[PDB]
Amino acid sequence: GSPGDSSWHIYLKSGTCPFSFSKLNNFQKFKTICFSTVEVPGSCNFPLEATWHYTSYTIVGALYVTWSEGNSITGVPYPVSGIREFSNLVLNNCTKY
Amino acid sequence: GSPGDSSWHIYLKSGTCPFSFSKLNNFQKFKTICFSTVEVPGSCNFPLE
Ligand SMILES: *[C@@H]1O[C@H](CO)[C@@H](O[C@@H]2O[C@H](CO)[C@@H](O[C@@H]3O[C@H](CO[C@H]4O[C@H](CO)[C@@H](O)[C@H](O)[C@@H]4O)[C@@H](O)[C@H](O[C@H]4O[C@H](CO[C@H]5O[C@H](CO)[C@@H](O)[C@H](O)[C@@H]5O)[C@@H](O)[C@H](O[C@H]5O[C@H](CO)[C@@H](O)[C@H](O)[C@@H]5O)[C@@H]4O)[C@@H]3O)[C@H](O)[C@H]2NC(C)=O)[C@H](O)[C@H]1NC(C)=O
Ligand SMILES: *[C@@H]1O[C@H](CO)[C@@H](O[C@@H]2O[C@H](CO)[C@@H](O[C@@H]3O[C@H](CO[C@H]4O[C@H](CO[C@H]5O[C@H](CO)[C@@H](O)[C@H](O)[C@@H]5O)[C@@H](O)[C@H](O[C@H]5O[C@H](CO)[C@@H](O)[C@H](O)[C@@H]5O)[C@@H]4O)[C@@H](O)[C@H](O[C@H]4O[C@H](CO)[C@@H](O)[C@H](O)[C@@H]4O)[C@@H]3O)[C@H](O)[C@H]2NC(C)=O)[C@H](O)[C@H]1NC(C)=O
């Protein structure tokens, strides 16, 4: 209720996967992913960290992710609703196509 | 008491860390290390033989 969590900072680290958690929403393409929160064979992971005012670090948990190369499943920045074919185009000055 | 360990040889191997256990005493620089003898996520290891 009262936000006593102001002192503790908890965030994700960088694991061994060949991508990043914050850049999965970009237009990245895969075949299957199947995230999980328990250990399974053949799967990279992102550790979790907890700290008090950036003095002493400790590891708390992890997130386990699998994947397989493909061209079927694509991430999206945010869920646009009400359309039938996701596309966008901005003209006449610099963009990132 | 009597050194019966004369036959058995036990030593460390080379793991997956990008350094060595016998050369950690040299002038090597880090930020934190925090050795442990139990499994924790995101950590290399030295086997025993
Ligand atoms: C390659 O070329 C093709 C050429 O066909 C491109 O496809 C066309 O792309 C156009 C541009 O998007 C489509 O036109 C409209 O796009 C609008 C996008 O919104 C932005 O732009 C408008 C422009 O005024 C702006 O106001 C708005 O704020 C946004 O900035 C859409 O909103 C719009 O949808 C509306 O119109 C359609 C069509 O209805 C029209 O025609 C009817 C007759 O068939 C007529 O009775 C209507 O009065 C109207 O004149 C309509 O279906 C939509 O309905 C919405 O609401 C209902 C609920 O009532 C909902 O159920 C439904 O799902 C909709 O949400 C809405 O009123 C236009 O789509 C154009 O439609 C595209 N044509 C085709 C065939 O796809 C293509 O993009 C190009 N590709 C590339 C890569 O460039
Ligand atoms: C380089 O690229 C950039 C891309 O970022 C581009 O920037 C665009 O610039 C154009 C103009 O040059 C901008 O278009 C303007 O849009 C104005 C309207 O925006 C207001 O109104 C929105 C809703 O309109 C209501 O009312 C109308 C009727 O008036 C109605 O039809 C609508 O349905 C609706 O009910 C409103 O949503 C919007 O707020 C958005 O943004 C805020 C943040 O600011 C956000 O918090 C909101 O949630 C929301 O997303 C805003 O309040 C419009 O008034 C304006 O018109 C003037 O210019 C035209 C010429 O263009 C004149 O003819 C006219 O007389 C006015 O003087 C103009 O059309 C556009 O928004 C910019 N951004 C994008 C992404 O396109 C640059 O132009 C490019 N070029 C250069 C050189 O930089």
From Swiss-Prot, chain A:
The KxHxx motif seems to function as an ER retrieval signal. Belongs to the alphacoronaviruses spike protein family. The chain holds residues 534 to 630 of 1356 of the full protein. This is Spike glycoprotein. Disulfide bonds join 17-44. It comes from the Viruses. Homotrimer. During virus morphogenesis, found in a complex with M proteins. Interacts with host ACE2. It is found in: Virion membrane; Host endoplasmic reticulum-Golgi intermediate compartment membrane. S1 region attaches the virion to the cell membrane by interacting with host ACE2, initiating the infection. Binding to the receptor probably induces conformational changes in the S glycoprotein unmasking the fusion peptide and activating membranes fusion. S2 region belongs to the class I viral fusion protein. Under the current model, the protein has at least 3 conformational states: pre-fusion native state, pre-hairpin intermediate state, and post-fusion hairpin state. Glycans are attached at residue 93. Glycosylated by host with heterogeneous N-linked glycans protruding from the trimer surface. Highly glycosylated by host, occluding many regions across the surface of the protein.
